[PDB]
């Protein structure tokens, strides 16, 4: 007491449903009296007792006078913040963890590990925090743009596993994994296989033995690089997802990429972080994923699922499981996370819904949550409700 | 450590008194600096250590720019929120539990169960949350409009009981009860008797054996359907309240519905959720109710009591027990709840006091609280103090 | 664990010093973004682990549109609120305990007892709350204006003692004391002696055997009625303070009231709640008191002290101990309270500094605190810093 | 349960890195809805479970109407406030500890000791608070201007050590040390050596036996007086730092003060509080310092380190260890502090970054934090991001 946490069997269920919308800019009107933080790249991570809603803030509020620059990704002001999930992340509700323009976090059963990358592009620095204490750092190994998941890391028996990558956004970016224990990096993991470009991995436990991630290739393909990480041997291998249902944005028509599973295909350049989460059952594994409704634009978000098989080798289309966000609403980064029920884990997907009015106004996001619950089919979609002119 | 909660004997007392007003829009002036949430359908539920003040928000604040739509009931933005009772439910104080346009919640002695219905009208979805975890769902069975109590559910020995209903607002709505244990629906209960139309049940423990509810018939009668639910056999029966003191709004004159207790009578169309709470004594049960002072309008709120007898068979008027809200002030939904003292339970009735300026402006509500305390007669009424023009 | 608290010997020291200013209207400008609550009658009460700053709010903020009425004492909106001492009592920081236009509170070692009087003037009602639960009430016994201390009640071995009074503001008001245990009134105490008019008692422990109070006579004298309450026999006696240093406002010149100690003297009509607190030493008792610098107006506040003797019988002038508030700053109600150090009690006096611009604007107060600390003499005075035009 | 705290070996690491910015005035726009407090002289102190971010407020917010006076140092409104480190210090987040225009604070492993000086210049008063209780005071001994550290005090085994000083800002200010146990001054320590002028000491543990301080001489020299305080014998000695790298501002060129280590040299008038913190290793001690990048202005802040030797006798330059704040940004007071990891201590330096637009506008500050973490070289600087016109 407290004990290390481990992945458990998932809670019973067979469909996702609309759970919760965090839409702080519903309160950002000039007529209003609130101060929602301007953010992007939200994610959620849960421990034994609570869930935290994290994001990267531009250290500015709406309404405010610092909108200029909020459409960019990196600067000296960007910070990793969080609130307890369900609270509106305002100036006062939020806590500022560390300076960061790329982030992650995960609870190991005893304490929170927070991860923030900042610094100049060519020599950025990953900083590790354990509770209140800054405990370790890790250096840029390709001197291009060291960065991390923008979603939860994953802990088992006190060992927290984290994806990082470094390299050109439009070229080679070979990722690695760090094994972090009580805030200190105790092992590096160098993946083999199809390693050309892997970033913004969304990772979870397929079992006590294996972590899988669905990631983004920003240069070469609209198929998602798919990591299989063995946590017993601390080794990782990556291959493209073979599914005809290409999960990236942009992407070509489903199934249109000819040749073997590793064929890159058309419209590979560009990308989006994608949602992915495991439903671990006694004798099968459900893999849930999300992608935009639009093939080319960050609009809408659909849910998909496949049980079992080998994602590296199966071209089978994923089963379309419902519209979480209609194509009329923005659908940007998405991520997986799991909530800890008393005796089982509940898989969820979160969706960043960015308010984009161009660089001439503020630029921020709402966060929508869908979770496995009950049976049947997914019933309702999510709108942000935000009018950017107000 | 902790243990399951059970209803106890009520604390001594023989009259209700004005306890507390939560009037958030006292701070919603355009000249002000506050952000009260636009809400309706408030209710309260307490556990061993705290009381939570719940409501359904339209995800908008006053002052703000999203007033349009706030007089409606169902949309994709409504959420179940809560604060600790005594705190002003603002943007920042509140926590958002889940997407919902109909709600309930209750503590079982160990944890909170949160209940929220959303989805499309003809295929709505009840969602169950236990602590942070989404644990179960229940589907529309009439495919008309699945909905729930808008007040506390009732747990005993870990089993929480909840009214749901489904059907046309102007036709048949046959309710059901769900037995829910640690977030999971473990039994469905199909009531017998007068089941024609039952919705918005206000329920509480008459004893360790019986839950009773005072509900709303929105189409056929101004008498309230009265549920008796046997918690040992998990069976329920419903009959109209026979009291001449009809508790719904609108309603005809007291005693004017002639014939046997089950006669429906006139002005049965329409209705209102009604307050109801038990005073449990050693060999005597007090039943306390509230109804608007106006027969046709949602204005005022009066308190009533009757001891013992059979509400199904007794035509005698309930005893008038004080003006909680004068006819000059709004009196909308009302509900019962119990606060846990060290060794006994304190029964209370809460009153939604809606600020209604029609659809061209904001639409929200204050909450007044009356509790059993001391002896004598109820001494003072409650006003919201809100000028909607400000 | 936890244990009942008892008064202990005071911490070492021989002078008071400026400790803390709570001045919420420093943040109430129309140019600002805060919401301090409009309040009056502040007081402080401490338990084993924290101090709470209480006050009676008009349920309105500055800036705001409900200034009209905030110069009055009683209405249906007035509420007892509190924050942890050191926090600014704004809309969001404060917690609303109960409806009340007269108040008190005290911790008994295990739990908080909150006291609120509301209702119509001729039949007001004292309500008792223990933790979150409403537990008891007490009725108007003179049907004129039931009211209470506007400062902390006093608990010993679980027994909490409270002054109340009832009667005309300009006539007879015979006070009583209630003995309250775990939120329920278990004994009434009817004082003997000079009982004509006693209100707004400021009470504390002279020892484990005796509570003393310095109170206000609003009709007959500028001497303060002085209560001696024996907590072992639950009996109380009241006599006027004999000191030439008349502690009320208005008052005549010091020492100018001729005749025996009970002589009423000139300028008896009108009054002000006064500060009073005990310094309990091994073999002597220090009584600390406060009164306005002005003889006739609520301006300034000076500190006074006398060790030992019989306040009923000693005409000796109190030793003037320093200016806490200069005569250029407002000085309204004042009160005593004690902070619990690890092994000893620290005596303090708090001062209500009202911002009074007349009934045509807002009307509220800052709170200044002085405490026994170290030796020597009192060094610095307190200003509110507030410009009422902003 | 809990036990007294002691300094431990420092966590491993060999460079500082940018950790966290607290820039409250990023939200202080007139177009905004926030209320950052106007503050100066921030510092940080951590205990076993949390770090507190302290400052001295002028009891005014931005935006607000009390800017006039905020560029001054001493008045009757200044207060020591704090938030949990990571929270934005606003009107509502902050807590007000006591009236003070000079401050300090530290945790002893069981409880917080708060230190605040106020009163008139020629008769100021140091006040000690332990938890909620005011426990002790210490009087002006030179009757010129009693003042204290503006940074954390240092506790070991329950004994907390604190620098105080008193004297003319432009003449002799002979400091003293107070030994404080559970809020009470149990010993005075009179330093020997070069005691001419010592103020604003930044102190920390070199070991279980020795506290060291880097201080400010405001009249005679740009070398920092360096205190060595033996905590076992309770004796202290002071000598100028001999390093060519003069740490004060203003200062002449490095190494340009000729003669023996004790030579005062030129441009000694004026000064600035300087950062200083220990890296304790098994057989090696790291001393980390900060000084402005400008020789004459409060602009920029650079980090420096030197291992071992005797700071009193060593003229060798400290090693430059990175630009924490470039010369383009304000660099005012700086201070050291330590965060408690599970088993080791993390040394940090904080930097006050003042927003100075002169006396015709508001005057306040951000706080930048750098901590020991990882290896390599310090990688990124800090900006406030504040446009004072907004
Ligand atoms: C992963 O391993 C953990 C630890 O072995 C498994 O958790 C245990 O499950 C058993 C049976 O359910 C319990 O009796 C233990 O108390 C659990 N250990 C704990 C809580 O620390 C977990 O089930 C495994 N995950 C799987 C099999 O998916
Ligand atoms: C309902 O049943 C519960 C459980 O049997 C009763 O609670 C017990 O009350 C007795 C004293 O009356 C206590 O000594 C027990 O410790 C209680 N048990 C629990 C589990 O709380 C409860 O009193 C019953 N309620 C009514 C109204 O009779
Ligand atoms: C009032 O009575 C209480 C209870 O008898 C006294 O508190 C005790 O003091 C002794 C000696 O200081 C301790 O050993 C006990 O533990 C205390 N009892 C507690 C803490 O419950 C208290 O000193 C008395 N007040 C006086 C004498 O002024
Ligand atoms: C200063 O002294 C304390 C107390 O002796 C040291 O703390 C102990 O450290 C050992 C291991 O190094 C632990 O096993 C003990 O439990 C610790 N005791 C306490 C009371 O904390 C501390 O290490 C010393 N600091 C330095 C820098 O040597
Ligand atoms: C508010 O929204 C509704 C959509 O149902 C629309 O019909 C109505 O015109 C809107 N009101 C205004 C003022 O635009
Ligand atoms: C601010 O206050 C000072 C008092 O020291 C006064 O001299 C000055 O004129 C004031 N400024 C304004 C703009 O009134
Ligand atoms: C910010 O926007 C302004 C307005 O066009 C532009 O002039 C300026 O160059 C921009 N600066 C940055 C850093 O984006
Ligand atoms: C409030 O003030 C207005 C303005 O003079 C006055 O007309 C009205 O009678 C007042 N009402 C109350 C209740 O004080
Ligand atoms: Ca791509
Ligand atoms: Ca009806
Ligand atoms: Ca008088
Ligand atoms: Ca100098």
Author numbering:
A (entry chain B), B (entry chain A), C (entry chain B), D (entry chain A): 76 to 465
Original authors' sentences:
The NA active site includes catalytic residues (R118, D151, R152, R224, E276, R292, R371, and Y406; N2 numbering) that interact directly with the sialic acid substrate and framework residues (E119, R156, W178, S179, D/N198, I222, E227, H274, E277, N294, and E425; N2 numbering) that stabilize the active site.
Sequencing of the NA gene in isolates revealed a unique mutation encoding an I221L substitution in NA at a level of 100% for isolates from a NPA obtained on D34 and a nasal swab specimen obtained on D40 and at a level of 80% for the isolate from a BAL obtained on D42. Analysis of HA and NA genes revealed that the only difference between oseltamivir-resistant and oseltamivir-susceptible isolates was the mutation conferring the I221L substitution in the NA gene. The Km revealed that the I221L NA variant had a 1.9 times lower affinity for the MUNANA substrate, and the Ki values for oseltamivir carboxylate and zanamivir showed affinities that were around 84 and 51 times lower, respectively, than that for wild-type NA. Moreover, the NA I221L substitution does not impair virus replicative fitness.
